[PDB]
Design a protein around this ligand. Structure first.
Ligand SMILES: *[C@H]1O[C@H](CO)[C@@H](O[C@@H]2O[C@H](CO)[C@@H](O)[C@H](O)[C@H]2NC(C)=O)[C@H](O)[C@H]1NC(C)=O
Ligand SMILES: CC(=O)N[C@@H]1[C@@H](O)[C@H](O)[C@@H](CO)O[C@H]1O
Ligand SMILES: *[C@@H]1O[C@H](CO)[C@@H](O)[C@H](O)[C@H]1NC(C)=O
Lengths: 49, 49
Protein backbone atom coordinates (compact mmCIF):
# COMPACT_ATOMS: atom_id res chain seq x y z
CA UNK A 1 0.00 0.00 0.00
CA UNK A 2 2.39 2.71 1.32
CA UNK A 3 5.68 1.35 -0.10
CA UNK A 4 4.61 0.42 -3.70
CA UNK A 5 7.30 1.18 -6.34
CA UNK A 6 4.72 3.14 -8.49
CA UNK A 7 1.39 4.74 -7.44
CA UNK A 8 -1.59 5.44 -9.79
CA UNK A 9 -2.51 8.73 -11.44
CA UNK A 10 -5.39 10.48 -9.52
CA UNK A 11 -7.66 10.41 -12.65
CA UNK A 12 -7.23 6.55 -12.62
CA UNK A 13 -7.12 6.11 -8.77
CA UNK A 14 -6.51 2.49 -7.68
CA UNK A 15 -8.84 0.55 -5.28
CA UNK A 16 -6.95 -2.33 -3.46
CA UNK A 17 -9.32 -4.46 -1.33
CA UNK A 18 -7.84 -5.66 2.06
CA UNK A 19 -9.04 -8.57 4.36
CA UNK A 20 -8.00 -11.47 6.74
CA UNK A 21 -5.18 -9.38 8.35
CA UNK A 22 -4.08 -7.23 11.34
CA UNK A 23 -3.77 -3.40 11.19
CA UNK A 24 -0.51 -2.57 13.16
CA UNK A 25 0.44 0.99 12.05
CA UNK A 26 3.54 1.08 14.44
CA UNK A 27 5.93 1.32 11.37
CA UNK A 28 3.51 3.94 9.97
CA UNK A 29 2.13 6.87 12.16
CA UNK A 30 5.14 6.43 14.47
CA UNK A 31 7.41 7.08 11.38
CA UNK A 32 8.00 10.67 10.15
CA UNK A 33 7.71 9.33 6.48
CA UNK A 34 4.33 11.13 5.93
CA UNK A 35 4.07 14.95 5.64
CA UNK A 36 0.27 14.49 6.22
CA UNK A 37 -1.50 11.72 8.10
CA UNK A 38 -5.00 12.83 9.28
CA UNK A 39 -7.84 10.64 10.51
CA UNK A 40 -11.31 12.35 10.67
CA UNK A 41 -13.44 10.06 12.94
CA UNK A 42 -10.80 8.35 15.18
CA UNK A 43 -7.66 9.41 17.11
CA UNK A 44 -4.62 8.00 15.23
CA UNK A 45 -3.50 6.32 18.51
CA UNK A 46 -6.83 4.25 18.71
CA UNK A 47 -6.28 2.44 15.34
CA UNK A 48 -4.54 -0.45 17.18
CA UNK A 49 -7.37 -1.02 19.72
CA UNK B 1 -5.01 -43.78 -19.17
CA UNK B 2 -1.66 -45.37 -20.11
CA UNK B 3 0.41 -43.23 -17.73
CA UNK B 4 -0.75 -45.78 -15.10
CA UNK B 5 -1.79 -42.76 -12.99
CA UNK B 6 -5.35 -41.47 -12.53
CA UNK B 7 -4.96 -37.81 -13.47
CA UNK B 8 -7.23 -34.88 -12.77
CA UNK B 9 -7.85 -32.98 -16.05
CA UNK B 10 -11.42 -31.47 -16.07
CA UNK B 11 -12.57 -28.54 -13.84
CA UNK B 12 -16.10 -27.47 -14.72
CA UNK B 13 -17.79 -25.96 -11.66
CA UNK B 14 -17.80 -22.21 -12.58
CA UNK B 15 -17.21 -20.18 -15.77
CA UNK B 16 -16.25 -16.82 -14.14
CA UNK B 17 -15.60 -15.25 -10.73
CA UNK B 18 -15.76 -11.45 -10.71
CA UNK B 19 -16.16 -10.04 -7.19
CA UNK B 20 -13.98 -11.85 -4.63
CA UNK B 21 -14.07 -11.32 -0.86
CA UNK B 22 -12.32 -14.29 0.74
CA UNK B 23 -9.57 -16.61 -0.56
CA UNK B 24 -7.73 -19.37 1.33
CA UNK B 25 -5.61 -22.12 -0.22
CA UNK B 26 -4.21 -24.94 1.94
CA UNK B 27 -0.49 -25.74 1.96
CA UNK B 28 -0.04 -27.94 -1.20
CA UNK B 29 -0.15 -31.73 -0.88
CA UNK B 30 -0.47 -34.86 -3.08
CA UNK B 31 -3.53 -36.98 -2.21
CA UNK B 32 -4.11 -40.12 -4.33
CA UNK B 33 -6.89 -40.36 -6.97
CA UNK B 34 -6.25 -44.13 -7.31
CA UNK B 35 -9.22 -46.44 -8.19
CA UNK B 36 -9.68 -48.28 -4.90
CA UNK B 37 -12.36 -51.07 -5.02
CA UNK B 38 -14.64 -53.39 -2.91
CA UNK B 39 -16.86 -51.54 -0.37
CA UNK B 40 -16.80 -48.06 1.36
CA UNK B 41 -13.74 -47.52 3.64
CA UNK B 42 -13.87 -43.86 4.76
CA UNK B 43 -16.77 -42.15 6.55
CA UNK B 44 -16.50 -38.37 6.23
CA UNK B 45 -19.13 -36.41 8.24
CA UNK B 46 -19.60 -32.61 7.96
CA UNK B 47 -21.91 -30.01 9.57
CA UNK B 48 -22.38 -26.61 7.98
CA UNK B 49 -23.95 -23.59 9.79
C1 LIG C 1 -18.33 -6.21 -9.54
O1 LIG C 1 -18.26 -6.27 -10.98
C2 LIG C 1 -19.51 -6.07 -11.64
C3 LIG C 1 -19.25 -6.19 -13.12
O2 LIG C 1 -18.13 -5.39 -13.51
C4 LIG C 1 -20.11 -4.72 -11.26
O3 LIG C 1 -21.39 -4.60 -11.86
C5 LIG C 1 -21.42 -3.34 -12.55
O4 LIG C 1 -21.80 -2.31 -11.64
C6 LIG C 1 -21.90 -0.93 -12.19
C7 LIG C 1 -22.20 0.04 -11.04
O5 LIG C 1 -23.42 -0.34 -10.38
C8 LIG C 1 -22.95 -0.97 -13.33
O6 LIG C 1 -23.03 0.32 -13.96
C9 LIG C 1 -22.58 -2.03 -14.37
O7 LIG C 1 -23.63 -2.04 -15.42
C10 LIG C 1 -22.43 -3.41 -13.70
N1 LIG C 1 -22.02 -4.41 -14.72
C11 LIG C 1 -22.48 -5.66 -14.78
C12 LIG C 1 -22.06 -6.51 -15.99
O8 LIG C 1 -23.20 -6.13 -13.90
C13 LIG C 1 -20.21 -4.58 -9.75
O9 LIG C 1 -20.65 -3.27 -9.40
C14 LIG C 1 -18.85 -4.85 -9.11
N2 LIG C 1 -18.93 -4.74 -7.66
C15 LIG C 1 -17.97 -4.19 -6.92
C16 LIG C 1 -18.21 -4.16 -5.44
O10 LIG C 1 -16.94 -3.74 -7.42
C1 LIG D 1 6.39 3.88 5.97
C2 LIG D 1 7.29 2.68 5.98
O1 LIG D 1 7.04 1.68 6.65
N1 LIG D 1 8.37 2.76 5.19
C3 LIG D 1 9.35 1.69 5.07
C4 LIG D 1 10.76 2.27 4.94
O2 LIG D 1 11.08 3.01 6.12
C5 LIG D 1 11.77 1.17 4.71
O3 LIG D 1 13.06 1.73 4.46
C6 LIG D 1 11.36 0.31 3.52
C7 LIG D 1 12.27 -0.88 3.30
O4 LIG D 1 11.75 -1.74 2.29
O5 LIG D 1 10.05 -0.22 3.75
C8 LIG D 1 9.03 0.79 3.88
C1 LIG E 1 -0.41 -38.60 -19.25
O1 LIG E 1 0.30 -37.55 -18.54
C2 LIG E 1 0.91 -36.55 -19.37
C3 LIG E 1 1.63 -35.60 -18.45
O2 LIG E 1 2.25 -36.27 -17.36
C4 LIG E 1 -0.17 -35.86 -20.20
O3 LIG E 1 0.44 -34.89 -21.06
C5 LIG E 1 -0.91 -36.89 -21.03
O4 LIG E 1 -1.96 -36.26 -21.75
C6 LIG E 1 -1.49 -37.98 -20.14
N1 LIG E 1 -2.15 -38.99 -20.96
C7 LIG E 1 -3.41 -39.41 -20.75
C8 LIG E 1 -3.92 -40.44 -21.71
O5 LIG E 1 -4.08 -38.99 -19.82
Amino acid sequence: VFNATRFASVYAWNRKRISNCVADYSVLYNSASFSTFKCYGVSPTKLND
Amino acid sequence: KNNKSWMESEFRVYSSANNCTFEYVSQPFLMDLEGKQGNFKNLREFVFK
